[PDB]
């Protein structure tokens, strides 16, 4: 199996630390966000950023499972660790032009 386990076991741990670091990244943009509901009222930008928000937050949770579900499997698939961070990836990117966009407001 060559360095394929070894490949898994170093994947599988940082995707678990770049998940964690997005759910509070995520969980960070609702104050701001309220913040802006507050001060400007909920207008129709402000209630889609609410959506992309929830969104984030609710395929986090679920590719959290995935990620709980491969740590369990003592053989996990490559494929499926690299297609999770490749979604991984996606949803940092995102997070960050949301974060950019409300500070902007």
Same mark, same amino acid.
Request: aromatic fraction near 2%.
């Given at each position: 199996?060559?360095?394929?386990?070894?490949?898994?076991?170093?994947?599988?741990?940082?995707?678990?630390?770049?998940?964690?670091?997005?759910?509070?990244?995520?969980?960070?943009?609702?104050?701001?966000?309220?913040?802006?509901?507050?001060?400007?009222? #909920?207008?129709?930008?402000?209630?889609?950023?609410?959506?992309?928000?929830?969104?984030?937050?609710?395929?986090?949770?679920?590719?959290?499972?995935?990620?709980?579900?491969?740590?369990?499997?003592?053989?996990?698939?490559?494929?499926?660790?690299?297609?999770?961070?490749?979604?991984?990836?996606?949803? #940092?990117?995102?997070?960050?032009?949301?974060?950019?966009?409300?500070?902007?407001?």
């Amino acid at each position: 199996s060559g360095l394929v386990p070894r490949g898994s076991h170093m994947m599988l741990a940082a995707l678990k630390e770049k998940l964690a670091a997005l759910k509070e990244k995520n969980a960070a943009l609702k104050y701001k966000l309220a913040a802006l509901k507050k001060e400007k009222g #909920e207008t129709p930008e402000l209630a889609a950023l609410e959506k992309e928000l929830a969104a984030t937050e609710k395929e986090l949770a679920a590719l959290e499972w995935e990620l709980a579900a491969l740590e369990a499997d003592p053989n996990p698939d490559p494929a499926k660790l690299a297609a999770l961070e490749k979604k991984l990836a996606a949803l #940092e990117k995102k997070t960050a032009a949301l974060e950019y966009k409300l500070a902007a407001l």
